[PDB]
């Protein structure tokens, strides 16, 4: 008996916040060409779909009394050019200088270092920007990854106070949290629990005052292959913190490593296709619906990060916990690198289409109501029109997911019933669908017989499977209603997008870049901040050799790989946005390219 999904577009309930716009990784590199492509792909997720890159060992990018910030500057500018912000973990030894945090003299040094950089990057990027940064403590303090740096319980507190006072020295507007650990039951997690006690009741190493600033409490809780397990563990900790530390009852909680399974480098077949992609969405849906949608004890949950910014190494291009699939093509002159947009990343773009208000939804099956703690669930959103550039929007994202388990055999009958669409000009809807049959680059790689050094055409055919199967913008049935009966696969994601026609056309594409891949092959990447609407069909790309359309299948991802059969790539490019009503926006300023 089918699953019934009901959406009431009239019933805009609470606000909906895009709390999942973060990724992260650990270096083993950060300035190499591999990473520059990687972060271009990450920053290319439409509508600021990913915003933060939580980066380990950032203070190893600083050398040594004075400091050389050259390497750190490089990475931060790379983040900056890709419209990203660091998850600035204050983690490193400044090239082996810092060794002991019970060393009174080193505690003062650290304070001065943190102040140094914060001010530097305030100078570099503007306090407005740097205040948005989540400055954080050393990653997982209770997991002992300090290298030669000695960090005792007391040491960790001096460390923190210096982090906090140092940041304040730069500006009071700067945000710092921690510890970024798991928070197991005591006697376990001594430093995580010790930190809170210290902030709640301790004395500031520098000022001697009681209580120390803590703008957020960050934890890591992973699923062990179960999606609800993440939400369940978080509840336990968040409640323990409310009751043990009453001052922190309103302190925002981040889970900045909220992954299905610990061990990114561990190959897993589900980490390759839409199994991972649908599950990531399921985790988020569960968090929205069963934690943040006005329950009874609504814990302050502000951030969920999928720690999947890693680069995959051979012989596991798709199977590892990464947003992109890396190919080190070692047999061309010279050896070059290529990246493939995995389903999980494409899925981040579908989440990105959700807007600031959550609509009322209900998933039932032949009578019985089902919370997102089941294989099929939904997130639905509505948008209040801002300027003349946008109109009313509805984003309905349905997922089908058995977590870490795929079932190609099975088929999931679903009947969506949308009601109560506010009346307005030119109401059309668009469907976007992802599954393992139609939308898996790993799948197509495997049909091609797993080429270890793929050719041009092999890459073209693998990229064919990146974007979700889209349907032409059909007009919405009379009386603000719509009924669909899709057959969903397991796993699968489906996003029905209902938009009304705004007054003005879309805005101008900006910040266009050409990034070389190999002979006769490049990446075109851009930015949508000024586009000013989410109702887009595709980006028209035009090429000149002293302008004609580059013919490609529809895609609203802010990255395109140009691999023409002629090999002719040298010239000039420009890009513009094309909405659901065939309306062209202004072209981006032309970008030149010489090979
Ligand atoms: C094209 O050319 C590139 C180089 O230009 C080659 O890329 C190298 O690929 C190999 C694997 O194919 C990489 O080596 C592997 O690194 C993994 C992670 O490395 C880091 O992490 C570990 C653990 O945290 C550290 O110990 C280590 O020092 C690194 O910091 C390891 O997990 C791998 O080891 C595992 O497999 C081997 C068997 O191969 C076992 O012996 C081990 O026990 C372990 O299980 C492995 O060492 C390497 O990093 C890549 N180099 C670069 C510079 O990118 C490609 O190989 C080549 N392509 C082809 C098809 O040949
Ligand atoms: C999500 O659903 C599962 C059931 O599928 C719940 O797990 C059950 O929890 C109860 C406690 O109320 C136990 O008695 C059962 O043994 C569990 N059943 C199974 C099949 O594991 C789980 O608690 C639900 N969690 C949330 C947060 O809704
Ligand atoms: C910092 O280091 C880089 C190389 O890593 C070097 O080229 C540069 O001269 C150094 N800068 C200063 C100011 O010493
Ligand atoms: O799951 C992991 O591989 C991981 F090692 O877990 C944690 F130990 C780390 O802090 C993360 O960098 C990383 O996601």
**Pairwise CA distance, residues 134 & 217, whole Å:** 11
Cα 409 to chain centroid, rounded: 31
Decide: 527 and 577 in contact? Cβ < 8 Å.
Answer: no
Question: 485: domain range?
Answer: 1-16+356-503
Resolution reached, in Å? 3.0
Decide: 143 and 181 in contact? Cβ < 8 Å.
Answer: yes
Q: Is the CB of 266 under 6 A from ligand 4?
A: no
Q: How far from 534 is each of 32, 398, 505, CA to CA, in Å?
A: 33, 18, 12
Half-sphere exposure for 190 (CA within 13 Å, toward CB): 10
Angle at 586 between CA 473 and CA 513, to 5 degrees: 100
**Pairwise CA distance, residues 404 & 92, whole Å:** 35
Q: How far from 129 is each of 33, 44, 72, 118, 126, CA to CA, in Å?
A: 26, 19, 17, 12, 6
> Which tokens hold the place of 292?
């943040």
Q: How far from 224 is each of 138, 194, 308, 403, CA to CA, in Å?
A: 24, 26, 16, 11
Pick the closest to residue 183 from 232, 135, 241, 123 (CA basis). Answer: 241
Looking at the fold, whether 380 and 473 belong to one and the same domain comes out as: yes
Write the CB contacts of 7 (distance below 8 Å, at least 6 apart in sequence). Answer: 359, 360, 361, 378, 380, 394, 396, 416, 417, 418, 419
469: left (phi over 0), alpha (psi -120 to 50) or beta: beta
Q: Kindly report the backbone phi and psi dihedral angles of residue 353, in degrees, each rounded to the nearest multiple of 5, phi listed first.
A: -80, -10
What's 528's domain CATH number? 2.60.40.10
Looking at the fold, whether 266 and 404 belong to one and the same domain comes out as: no
Residue nearest to atom 27 of ligand 2 (CA): 232
Atom in ligand 2 nearest the alpha carbon of residue 371:
28
Instruction: List, in sequence order, every residue forming a beta bridge with 584; answer none if it has no partner.
Output: 578
**Pairwise CA distance, residues 46 & 38, whole Å:** 15
> Which tokens hold the place of 515?
């990034």
Number of domains in the chain: 3
Is the previous residue joined to 470 through a cis bond, with omega within 30 degrees of 0? no
Residue where a domain terminates, one of 337, 355, 373: 355
Query: Of the residues 371, 373, 374, 403, which should be mutated to test ligand 2's pocket, given the most ligand atoms within 8 Å of the CB?
Result: 373
Decide: 261 and 222 in contact? Cβ < 8 Å.
Answer: yes
What lines the ligand 3 site, CB under 6 Å?
68, 70
**Pairwise CA distance, residues 496 & 499, whole Å:** 10
- For the CA of 28, the nearest ligand: 1
DSSP 401: -
What's 206's domain CATH number? 3.20.20.80
Residues 213, 216, 222, 223, CA torsion sign: positive
Q: How many contiguous H segments (helices) and E segments (strands) does the chain have? A: 11, 29
Q: How far from 269 is each of 319, 404, 405, CA to CA, in Å?
A: 6, 9, 10
- Distance spanning both ends of the chain, measured CA to CA: 59
Pick the closest to residue 213 from 164, 174, 169, 249 (CA basis). Answer: 164
Beta strands 175-181; 134-136: pairing state: parallel
Looking at the fold, whether 236 and 342 belong to one and the same domain comes out as: yes
**String of DSSP letters for 419-447:** E-PPP-TT-EEEEEEEETTTS-HHHHHHH
Q: How far from 107 is each of 126, 148, 168, 174, CA to CA, in Å?
A: 27, 16, 15, 20
**Pairwise CA distance, residues 64 & 79, whole Å:** 23
224: left (phi over 0), alpha (psi -120 to 50) or beta: left
Give per-residue burial for 48-81: e unless 16+ CB within 10 Å, then b: ebbbbbbbbbbbbbbeeeebebebbbebbebbbb
Residue where a domain terminates, one of 503, 538, 564: 503
> Which tokens hold the place of 344?
């999980």
**Pairwise CA distance, residues 314 & 326, whole Å:** 8
Looking at the fold, whether 453 and 574 belong to one and the same domain comes out as: no
**Pairwise CA distance, residues 1 & 590, whole Å:** 54
> Which tokens hold the place of 87?
């998850």
- For the CA of 66, the nearest ligand: 3
Give per-residue burial for 192-209: e unless 16+ CB within 10 Å, then b: bbbbbebbbebebbbeee
Q: Is the CB of 140 under 6 A from ligand 4?
A: yes
Cα 86 to chain centroid, rounded: 12
Looking at the fold, whether 415 and 479 belong to one and the same domain comes out as: yes
Looking at the fold, whether 136 and 191 belong to one and the same domain comes out as: yes
**Pairwise CA distance, residues 147 & 421, whole Å:** 58
DSSP 396: E
Decide: 572 and 593 in contact? Cβ < 8 Å.
Answer: yes
Q: How far from 495 is each of 108, 351, 473, CA to CA, in Å?
A: 53, 9, 13
The alpha carbon of 229 and the centre of ligand 2 are apart by a number of angstroms equal to 10
Beta strands 22-25; 52-55: pairing state: parallel
What lines the ligand 1 site, CB under 6 Å?
28, 265, 313-314, 328, 330, 452
**Pairwise CA distance, residues 474 & 73, whole Å:** 48
**String of DSSP letters for 466-523:** SS-EE---EEPPTTT-EEE--EEEESEEEEEEEE---SS-----EEEEEEEEETTEEE
Write the CB contacts of 53 (distance below 8 Å, at least 6 apart in sequence). Answer: 22, 23, 24, 25, 39, 42, 79, 84, 85, 86, 87, 309
> Which tokens hold the place of 392?
């009313």
Half-sphere exposure for 576 (CA within 13 Å, toward CB): 17
DSSP 560: E
What's 478's domain CATH number? 2.60.40.1500
Method: X-ray
Pick the closest to residue 574 from 590, 550, 557 (CA basis). Answer: 590
Looking at the fold, whether 382 and 490 belong to one and the same domain comes out as: yes
Give per-residue burial for 558-594: e unless 16+ CB within 10 Å, then b: bbbbbbeeeeebeebbbbbbbbbbebebbbbeeeebe
Residue where a domain terminates, one of 355, 380, 415: 355
Looking at the fold, whether 314 and 389 belong to one and the same domain comes out as: no
Pick the closest to residue 563 from 517, 514, 513 (CA basis). Answer: 517
Q: Kindly report the backbone phi and psi dihedral angles of residue 354, in degrees, each rounded to the nearest multiple of 5, phi listed first.
A: -65, 145
Looking at the fold, whether 2 and 47 belong to one and the same domain comes out as: no
> Which tokens hold the place of 335?
């050896």
């Amino acid at each position: 008996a089918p699953h019934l999904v009901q959406v009431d577009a009239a019933r805009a309930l609470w606000p909906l916040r895009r709390f999942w716009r973060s990724t992260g990784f650990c270096p083993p590199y950060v300035l190499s060409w591999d990473q520059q492509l990687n972060l271009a792909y990450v920053g290319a997720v439409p509508h600021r779909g990913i915003k933060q890159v939580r980066t380990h060992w950032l203070l190893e990018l600083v050398t040594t009394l004075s400091y050389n910030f050259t390497h750190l500057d490089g990475y931060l500018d790379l983040l900056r050019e890709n419209q990203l912000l660091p998850g600035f973990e204050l983690m490193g030894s400044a090239s082996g200088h810092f060794t002991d945090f019970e060393d009174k003299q080193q505690v003062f040094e650290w304070k001065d270092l943190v102040s140094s950089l914060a001010r530097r990057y305030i100078g570099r990027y503007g306090l407005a920007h740097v205040s948005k940064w989540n400055f954080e403590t050393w990653n997982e303090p209770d997991h002992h990854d300090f290298d030669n740096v000695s960090m005792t319980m007391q040491g960790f507190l001096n460390y923190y106070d210096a982090c906090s006072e140092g940041l304040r020295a730069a500006s009071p507007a700067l945000r710092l949290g921690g510890p970024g650990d798991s928070f197991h039951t005591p006697p376990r997690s001594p430093l995580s629990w010790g930190l809170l006690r210290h902030c709640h009741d301790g004395t500031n190493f520098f000022t001697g005052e009681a209580g120390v600033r803590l703008d957020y409490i960050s934890l890591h809780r992973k699923g062990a292959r179960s999606s609800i397990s993440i939400l369940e563990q978080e509840k336990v900790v968040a409640q323990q913190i409310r009751q043990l530390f009453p001052k922190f009852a309103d302190t925002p909680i981040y889970n900045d490593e909220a992954d299905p399974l610990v061990g990114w480098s561990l190959p897993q077949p589900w980490r390759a296709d839409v199994t991972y992609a649908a599950m990531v969405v399921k985790v988020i849906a569960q968090h929205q619906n069963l934690l943040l949608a006005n329950t009874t004890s609504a814990f302050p949950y502000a951030l969920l990060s999928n720690d999947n910014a890693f680069l995959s190494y051979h012989p596991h291009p798709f199977a590892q916990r990464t947003l992109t699939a890396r190919f080190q093509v070692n047999n061309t002159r010279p050896p070059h690198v290529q990246l493939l947009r995995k389903p999980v990343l494409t899925a981040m773009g579908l989440l990105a289409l959700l807007d600031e208000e959550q609509l009322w939804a209900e998933v039932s099956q032949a009578g019985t109501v089902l919370d997102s703690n089941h294989t099929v669930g939904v997130l639905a959103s509505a948008h209040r029109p801002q300027g003349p550039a946008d109109a009313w929007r509805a984003a309905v994202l349905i997922y089908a997911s058995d977590d870490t388990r795929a079932h190609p055999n099975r088929s999931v009958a679903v009947t969506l019933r949308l009601r109560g669409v506010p009346p307005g000009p030119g109401l059309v809807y668009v469907t976007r669908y992802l599954d393992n049959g139609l939308c898996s680059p790993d799948g197509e790689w495997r049909r091609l017989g797993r080429p270890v050094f793929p050719t041009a055409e092999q890459f073209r055919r693998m990229r064919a499977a990146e974007d979700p199967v889209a349907a032409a913008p059909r007009p919405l049935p009379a009386g603000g209603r719509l009924t669909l009966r899709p057959a969903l696969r397991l796993p699968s994601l489906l996003l029905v997008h209902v938009c009304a026609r705004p007054e003005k056309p879309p805005g101008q594409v900006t910040r266009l870049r050409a990034l070389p891949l190999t002979q006769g092959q490049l990446v075109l990447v851009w930015s949508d901040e000024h586009v000013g609407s989410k109702c887009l069909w595709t980006y028209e790309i035009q090429f000149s050799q002293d302008y004609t359309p580059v013919s490609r299948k529809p895609s609203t991802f802010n990255l395109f790989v140009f691999s023409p059969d002629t090999g002719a790539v040298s010239g000039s490019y420009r890009v513009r946005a094309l909405d659901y009503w065939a309306r062209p926006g202004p072209f981006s300023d032309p970008v030149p390219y010489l090979e």
